[PDB]
Design a protein around this nucleic acid. Sequence first.
DNA 1: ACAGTTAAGAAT
DNA 2: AATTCTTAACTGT
Length: 97
Amino acid sequence: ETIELKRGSNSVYVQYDDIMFFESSTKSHRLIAHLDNRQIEFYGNLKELSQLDDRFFRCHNSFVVNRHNIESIDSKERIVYFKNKEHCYASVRNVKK
DNA sequence: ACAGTTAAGAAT
DNA sequence: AATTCTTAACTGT
């Protein structure tokens, strides 16, 4: 299961479970794939990534998480912790799901 | 329910 | 390829 992260003249190819989560970049129409120890900026939209696979869940407007790489959830604070020790946030309306 | 912020379409 | 404007739909309380 591999995904092509398109970057204009380049592409980077990554396995689904290399990915902790995706977040929107502050560069318009770019996302950031968070991997174990690297981050890769690419062209995409979050909606499309969440439809690739059941493991990819839109927990927030700005985040798509890989369920397989979740270490724990603090549902009080709405913080999703990943196996590489990063974290991101779940929205009030999506945290339960 | 609100006001502030943002993802993503379209065009090029 | 990379960028802008736009706006509905998101955000947290």
